[PDB]
Design a protein around this ligand. Structure first.
Ligand SMILES: Nc1nc2c(ncn2[C@@H]2O[C@H](COP(=O)(O)OP(=O)(O)NP(=O)(O)O)[C@@H](O)[C@H]2O)c(=O)[nH]1
Lengths: 300, 901
């Protein structure tokens, strides 16, 4: 694998209270939605580097949300913080009441990232929708959609919805990664060639250590959007369960009535799963096609 | 891994050492001749058939290591224990590692001391010093002037007997400490007089109302001074004992006085230990390179009872949580019939308490009689209650001389329960991947992120001595005052902290936080290098572990040409606009250039040499104009936009690159130290010593401190110039380090000290505490700021008077003792501050006169025939107060010599 070790930059900001550092801590430290009750208060700034399928490494900044810390962001050392920013994530509570101060901070943050980043991008993320009934969830998410599309006028934003007790979190950060990835077309072409000459239902390729949905190809378009989210959540739950057994996963097989899915290592940090559109085949096809795939991806 | 023992017939001690798999005894060795005269006299030639070759797994369960004359942070102690995992030892070996050295001592297995033996990974080593920093607080009361049994004053017992014994043992074990000897006491009913108001205090009791006026006095004797040949302090303490009752009674306020209150009824004891902690919290301010251990000893004639407020006792428990340094000894004798260190509470059954943090020891006198009584007598004329103090049994307590002559450093490994749940509801993990780089920039990112040096948690420092009136008893300090407010906070309510700092390759450091105890776990620079360094920096503060011809060097060359610049200060025609002849045929002659080799510098040269060349051949001081004119063709630096560099008198270190990294926030407890460069002239420095008798203003450099071939540790530290001019005034260099071993930096400082003195002038480390009050970020609670008045007796008074004051100062310049305006680095530059050249003396310019203080950082090294011999400083005091209060006609003759121009 050609190791072009770049260094990307991503900030995570918003108001204190709900879900600022909790989501980062469950997506890069193998926690659960129950054990994230113990993180508590952060401080002004804390950051991290995370490596990610090899070459790309994220400077992930986590910024606090008290009054003095946001004021000491805006009317202070701002030029150091908002410089060379690539990806911004801005967290929205649902249950919080002071919407005026939230959008005031949002306006100031948009103007500051405009005057310190021409070609960055902002993803705003309304989380913690686990407390509201589903019809009102639709209404509140559409109102946040339209209101944030208005107030994010001179530069665009992408607004997603999520909670911690479900899998839309994994979809949203899959979207963040797939935007943040360097290369697309060669991996798409190898994906498409593999899937159209070994005739699978659908093929899926992932990072190993955190399992975010990198790429996918299908020919049975009857699962709407929630297949990727669900399978990622449940096998990372299984990896968390096997974590307490001092053992790695690296390989599994399942077949069913009209169903044949397989998971294995591909490369140094990549998982593959596949369902193969022919359920009555033993592991000889998985053998010859992990051969057929590792001849090509270990030329990549 | 083979072990070889070699006695002879009936040697009652033995000897043994290591090699790697010796079987056939072809090869022997000589490495040490000393061990013959260290153990036993014989001459063993090649094979006398006595050399036993045996594995013999015999361990040495506790080994002691003593230090001398150095400064070793506890990470370096961790490095010595990491290098001392699997070796052998014997009594009085000199163990070395990387310029660090210790002497082995008193090595025990479980009952008995062994001559030699083996150390493998599970025996424990304990570090002790004979070069510590030690305070002696003598508590005075009315029991000093009271007799006891055997016939003595308790003062005379204490000082004469105990201090004579302690100083004889300090001579015998050949130690060298830095002491204070501070007398302290209280008086009652000293309410008020003419402007003595913020000195008093007022004591009270809640449950039964009782409120009185009182006042605390401290009289210091020698403050920060090492010297051999003691017992002169014993004579001075006798003088102060006789002078003491008038010295304490008839001062600042005069109501009816009651002196020196009883220890078993009142006392300023707990406040005295808390003020010693108020000294020791700021150990990182001005760092001696010649002391390691910390020690505070309180000598009392008390019984062991103290009537103490609740808040101060809980606060000093929480402050000895950090750095345990306190030792109490009683020269009263008469070990009472109960648990002897005890506190009756004084809160705003009589509520007892017993401390288990303190180290008490009695001093019995030397005589032999029948039945030593344990009682006094004086004839008047006329829910729980869970600690009582009486059912605790207590036979005898010694003196514990070994914890008073060689102080023990704080341990390394302690066992305690894990970080489960419940109370400490906060954990935070930071996994910090590390990118190796070959360009110093990698530790500080993790450092300022993951802790901000206890950026999470608070330092419980609630005692602030804000006021101190002083008294004009003599030229030591003499602060006599009130403690000021005590702004106590409770501990962190309903949550402690713990942290998980990961290296994303394979490494974890699990920090707990009630006292900083760690658990390190494994699974350009290497990974383990950065991991070890980070564990050392968590180790430095609170560090428990759970377990189970130009030589073109970038300072030397410029320092040497700044030595060349005094002795050179103190071709064809010009006016050709071609400029090719002179500026291209400089290399035709013998013009010395930096062009043979150095990094980032093909064809380089120094401005001062070139301008001295152009004054040696062309006109005087118009060379910078033509130098700018040729700079418009041939440059020096990277992105110039300047004049001819700096034309004259401006320091630049190396690292040619600085234009086109995390800084040091001052919360992080930087270890800093200000060395100093003082232009000097010996021609007056000798006779006043002898029988004769009357462009910015700071610059940062991040340098690598190594002249070796190590390839184990990358080692950097940050210099700040204050000077970019160095006209003929002072010069100073600050060293900020949050980094590598201090002893290597000490030999770097001493290396360019040897380059300073030989071929040049003085470099002296200077206390960068100016005339600062207590409760400042610099300073002590024990500084006088001595005053010297200018009795004159003869439009814009102050400016002309300031210039006349400079004239008197530099007149002491011309006759004995030169001056320099040490332009320090605080913005708007409040007070004018002079350092004297070649001496121990600070002055500032604020009555009419101007004030004085005494430098305490020379300490008999960094010493030449220019400076030195503290009698010099006292002579300059005597001469300066004679010249200042208008003796014979000196100021008046100075007036005439000024007016006759
Ligand atoms: N049940 C539930 N709890 C949530 C949800 N989102 C956040 N929380 C709770 O909110 C708490 C706060 O975590 P978080 O907001 O990340 O902390 P922080 O804001 O970074 N600390 P600071 O205020 O110093 O910046 C977590 O303990 C978590 O249990 C959610 O969707 N469901």
């Amino acid at each position: 694998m050609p190791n072009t070790a770049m260094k990307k930059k991503v900030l995570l900001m918003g108001k204190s209270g709900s879900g600022k550092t909790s989501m980062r801590s469950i997506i890069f430290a193998n926690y659960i939605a129950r054990d994230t009750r113990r993180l508590g208060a952060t401080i002004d700034v804390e950051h991290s580097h995370v490596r990610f399928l090899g070459n790309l490494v994220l400077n992930l900044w986590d910024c606090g949300g008290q009054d003095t810390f946001m004021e000491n962001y805006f009317t202070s050392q701002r030029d150091n913080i908002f410089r060379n920013v690539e990806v911004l994530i801005y967290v929205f509570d649902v249950e919080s009441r002071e919407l005026e101060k939230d959008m005031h901070y949002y306006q100031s943050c948009l103007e500051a990232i405009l005057q310190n980043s021409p070609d960055a991008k902002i993803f705003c993320l309304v989380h913690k929708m686990d407390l509201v009934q589903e019809d009102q969830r639709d209404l509140i998410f559409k109102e946040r959609e339209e209101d944030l599309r208005r107030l994010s006028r001179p530069l665009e934003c992408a607004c997603f919805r999520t909670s911690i007790w479900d899998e839309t979190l994994y979809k949203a950060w899959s979207s963040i990664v797939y935007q943040l990835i360097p290369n697309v077309q060669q991996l798409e072409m190898n994906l498409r060639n593999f899937a159209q000459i070994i005739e699978a239902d659908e093929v899926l390729l992932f990072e190993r250590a955190t399992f975010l949905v990198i790429s996918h190809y299908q020919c049975k378009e009857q699962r709407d959007v929630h297949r990727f989210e669900k399978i990622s959540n449940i096998i990372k739950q299984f990896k968390l369960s096997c974590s307490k057994l001092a053992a790695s996963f690296q390989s599994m097989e399942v077949r069913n009535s009209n169903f044949a899915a397989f998971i294995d290592i591909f490369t140094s940090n990549t998982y593959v799963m596949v369902v193969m559109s022919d359920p009555s085949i033993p592991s000889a096809a998985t053998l010859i096609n992990i051969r057929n795939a590792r001849k090509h991806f270990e030329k990549l | 891994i083979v072990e070889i023992a070699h006695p002879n017939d009936e040697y009652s001690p033995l000897l043994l050492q290591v090699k790697s798999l010796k079987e056939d005894l072809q090869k022997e060795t000589i490495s040490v001749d000393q061990t013959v005269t260290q153990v036993f006299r014989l001459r063993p030639y090649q094979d006398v058939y006595v050399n036993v070759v045996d594995p013999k797994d015999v361990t040495l369960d506790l080994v002691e290591l003593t230090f001398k004359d150095q400064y070793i942070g506890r990470g370096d102690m961790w490095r010595l224990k990491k290098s001392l995992v699997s070796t052998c030892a014997y009594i009085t070996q000199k163990v070395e590692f990387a310029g660090i050295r210790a002497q082995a001592g008193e090595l025990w297995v479980k009952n008995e001391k062994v001559m030699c033996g083996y150390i493998s990974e599970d025996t424990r080593v304990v570090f002790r010093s004979t070069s510590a920093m030690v305070y002696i607080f003598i508590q005075m009361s009315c029991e000093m002037w009271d007799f006891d049994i055997y016939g003595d004053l308790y003062f005379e017992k204490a000082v004469n007997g105990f201090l004579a014994d302690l100083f004889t043992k300090w001579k015998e074990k050949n130690c060298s400490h830095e002491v204070t000897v501070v007398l302290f006491s209280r008086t009652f009913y000293d309410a008020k007089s003419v402007d003595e108001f913020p000195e008093i205090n007022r004591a009270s009791i809640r449950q039964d109302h009782k409120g009185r006026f009182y006042e605390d006095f401290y009289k210091v004797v020698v403050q920060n001074e090492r010297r051999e040949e003691w017992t002169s302090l014993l004579v001075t303490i006798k003088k102060l004992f006789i002078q003491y009752p008038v010295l304490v009674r008839l001062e600042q306020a005069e109501g009816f006085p009651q002196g020196d209150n009883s220890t078993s009824a009142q006392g300023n004891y707990l406040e005295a230990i808390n003020l010693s902690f108020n000294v020791f919290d700021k150990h990182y301010i001005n760092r001696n390179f010649d002391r390691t251990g910390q020690m505070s000893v309180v000598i009392t004639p008390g019984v062991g009872v103290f009537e103490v407020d609740r808040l101060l006792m809980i606060l000093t428990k929480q402050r000895m949580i950090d750095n345990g340094i306190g030792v109490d000894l009683v020269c009263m004798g008469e070990q009472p019939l109960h648990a002897v260190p005890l506190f009756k509470l004084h809160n705003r059954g009589d509520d007892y308490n017993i401390p288990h943090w303190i180290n008490h020891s009695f001093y019995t006198s030397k005589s032999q009689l029948f039945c030593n009584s344990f009682t006094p007598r004086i004839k008047l004329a006329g829910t729980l209650s869970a600690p009582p103090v009486v059912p605790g049994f207590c036979c005898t307590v010694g003196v514990d001389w070994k914890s008073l002559t060689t102080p023990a450093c704080l341990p390394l490994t302690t066992d305690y329960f894990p970080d489960r749940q419940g109370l400490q509801n906060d954990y935070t993990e930071g996994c910090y991947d590390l990118l190796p780089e070959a360009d110093a920039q990698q530790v500080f990112e993790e450092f300022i992120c993951q802790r901000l040096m206890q950026g999470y948690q608070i330092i419980v420092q609630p005692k602030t001595q804000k006021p101190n009136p002083a008294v004009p008893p003599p030229l030591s300090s003499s602060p006599l005052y009130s403690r000021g407010l005590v702004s106590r906070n409770r501990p962190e309510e309903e949550d402690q902290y713990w942290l998980s700092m990961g290296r994303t390759f394979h490494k974890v450091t699990l920090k707990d936080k009630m006292i900083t105890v760690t658990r390190y776990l494994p699974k350009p620079r290497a990974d383990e290098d950065e991991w070890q360094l980070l564990d050392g920096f968590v180790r430095f503060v609170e560090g428990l572990n759970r377990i189970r011809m130009d030589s073109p060097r970038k300072d030397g060359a410029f320092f040497m040409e700044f030595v060349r610049s005094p002795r050179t200060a103190s071709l064809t025609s010009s006016s050709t606009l071609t400029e090719i002849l002179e500026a291209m045929k400089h290399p035709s002659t013998g013009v010395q250039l930096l062009s043979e080799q150095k990094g980032l510098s093909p064809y380089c040269f120094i401005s001062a040499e070139v301008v001295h060349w152009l004054v040696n051949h062309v006109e005087g001081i118009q060379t910078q104009a033509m130098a700018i004119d040729i700079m418009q063709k041939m440059l020096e630096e990277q992105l110039i936009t300047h004049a001819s560099g700096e034309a004259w008198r401006t320091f630049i270190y190396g690292f040619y690159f600085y234009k086109i990294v995390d800084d040091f926030a001052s919360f992080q407890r930087k270890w800093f130290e200000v060395a100093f460069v003082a232009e000097e002239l010996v021609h007056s420095e000798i006779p006043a010593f002898l029988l004769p008798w009357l462009v910015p203003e700071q610059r940062t450099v991040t340098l690598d401190v190594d002249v070796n071939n190590r390839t184990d540790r990358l080692e950097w530290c940050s210099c700040y110039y204050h000077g970019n001019f160095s006209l003929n005034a002072a010069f100073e260099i600050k060293l900020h380090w949050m980094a590598v071993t201090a002893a290597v930096l000490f030999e770097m400082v001493q290396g360019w000290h040897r380059k300073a003195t030989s071929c040049g002038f003085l470099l002296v480390p200077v206390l960068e505490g100016p005339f600062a009050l207590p409760s400042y970020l610099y300073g002590d609670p024990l500084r006088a700021q001595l005053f010297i008045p200018l009795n004159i007796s003869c439009e814009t008074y102050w400016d002309r008077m300031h210039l006349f004051q400079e004239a008197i100062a530099h007149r002491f310049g011309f006759v004995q003792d030169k001056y320099s305006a040490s332009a320090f680095n605080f913005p708007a530059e409040n007070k004018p501050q002079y350092i004297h050249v070649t001496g121990t003396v600070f002055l500032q310019l604020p009555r009419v006169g101007y004030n004085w203080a005494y430098n305490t950082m020379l300490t008999k090294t960094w010493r030449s025939s220019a400076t030195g011999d503290e009698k010099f400083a006292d002579r300059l005091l005597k001469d300066f107060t004679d010249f200042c209060i208008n003796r014979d006609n000196r100021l008046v003759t100075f007036w005439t010599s000024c007016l006759e121009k």
